[PDB]
Amino acid sequence: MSVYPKALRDEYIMSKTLGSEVKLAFERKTCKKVAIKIISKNVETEIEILKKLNHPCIIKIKNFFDAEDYYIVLELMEGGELFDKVVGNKRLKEATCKLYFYQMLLAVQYLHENGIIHRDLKPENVLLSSQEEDCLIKITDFGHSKILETSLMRTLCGTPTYLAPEVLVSVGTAGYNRAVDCWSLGVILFICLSGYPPFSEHRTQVSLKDQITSGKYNFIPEVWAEVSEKALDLVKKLLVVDPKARFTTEEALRHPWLQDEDMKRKFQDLLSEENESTALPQVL
Ligand SMILES: c1ccc2c(c1)[nH]c1[nH]cn[n+]12
Ligand SMILES: [Cl-]
């Protein structure tokens, strides 16, 4: 019913759908597998963000085509989406949750340090590097991201003779937008550890909205008894209603659940294993 642009076709051979829009492709030059995200005709900001960022737990953009549709050429993540590992009460072993979560915190810490809020962190935006359970993860889908309160800061420089009270009231919470990412991470971690969502409409009277605002997650003890008290304590500190009290990425990384030298060693191992193919000889 349509064709690929001549500019894309020149550099790549298009193949099978990976996610439905993400297709598999081969770079003609290298014969290496790539991932091509097709967006129907925001994408300009997403490219701008992707190009500037450089972290091993954040997806890299390889190329871009602005045609009848937008084509974003990205690194292929063979393991697919983390969603596929947690769907329909499927659960990850605590050790796997830790390894993936640690990387997610490093990735999100990097974003916040670089003035970027993702705003749409979910298992569908967390990609696995291989079909192995001990693998590298990367955050994707920067379409809803924000670049960090200059409008309020400038307003405060003047005399508030004519300034509205709601604006002065907003000074209290201003600059805590990044806390939304820490909430999302808390929800992801809950799902990964238990196989079930903390807030849902399944077998409950209370509205999904009321559950979230009260911060009263559904706690099923039979499920959680299999999970450590440390892992649950970290979830608890991220699923905090007050964004000013909620755990930051630094506080989450300093948590006892993350003070695991074995998990840290396994991640560094996976890094060197990935980076061995690109490593140039160095001055000793
Ligand atoms: C399944 C769905 C999306 C995918 C994928 C496999 N691999 C990869 N690399 C970038 N996005 N993406
Ligand atoms: Cl075609």
Structural features, described:
ATP binds at residues 37, 75-81, 124-125, 141. This is Serine/threonine-protein kinase Chk2. The chain has 284 residues and is α+β, with helices and mostly antiparallel strands. The chain has 2 domains: 1-76, Phosphorylase Kinase, domain 1 (2-Layer Sandwich); 77-284, Transferase(Phosphotransferase) domain 1 (Transferase(Phosphotransferase), domain 1, Orthogonal Bundle), CATH 1.10.510.10. Helices cover 39% and strands 16% of the residues. It is built from 12 helices and 10 strands. The protein has a 5-stranded antiparallel β-sheet. A hairpin with a 5-residue loop joins strand 2 and strand 3. Helix 4 (94-113) runs antiparallel to helix 7 (179-194), helix 4 crosses helix 12 (261-275) and helix 7 (179-194) runs antiparallel to helix 10 (229-238). It starts with 5 loop residues before the first helix and ends in a 9-residue tail after the last helix. The structure holds 3,4-dihydro[1,2,4]triazolo[1,5-a][3,1]benzimidazol-9-ium and chloride ion.
What is the number of strand segments?
10
C-alpha end-to-end distance:
58 Å
What's the main sheet like?
5 strands, antiparallel
List of distinct ligands in this structure: 3,4-dihydro[1,2,4]triazolo[1,5-a][3,1]benzimidazol-9-ium, chloride ion
In CATH terms, what is the fold-level topology of the largest domain? Transferase(Phosphotransferase), domain 1
Shape call: globular
CATH class identity of the largest domain: Mainly Alpha
The SS-based structural class is: alpha+beta
Helix content: 25-40%
Spatial order of strands in the largest sheet: 1-2-3-5-4
Rg on CA atoms, Å: 21 Å
Q: Which architecture of the largest domain would the CATH scheme give at its second level? A: Orthogonal Bundle
**Number of helical elements:** 12
Q: What's the structural domain tally?
A: 2
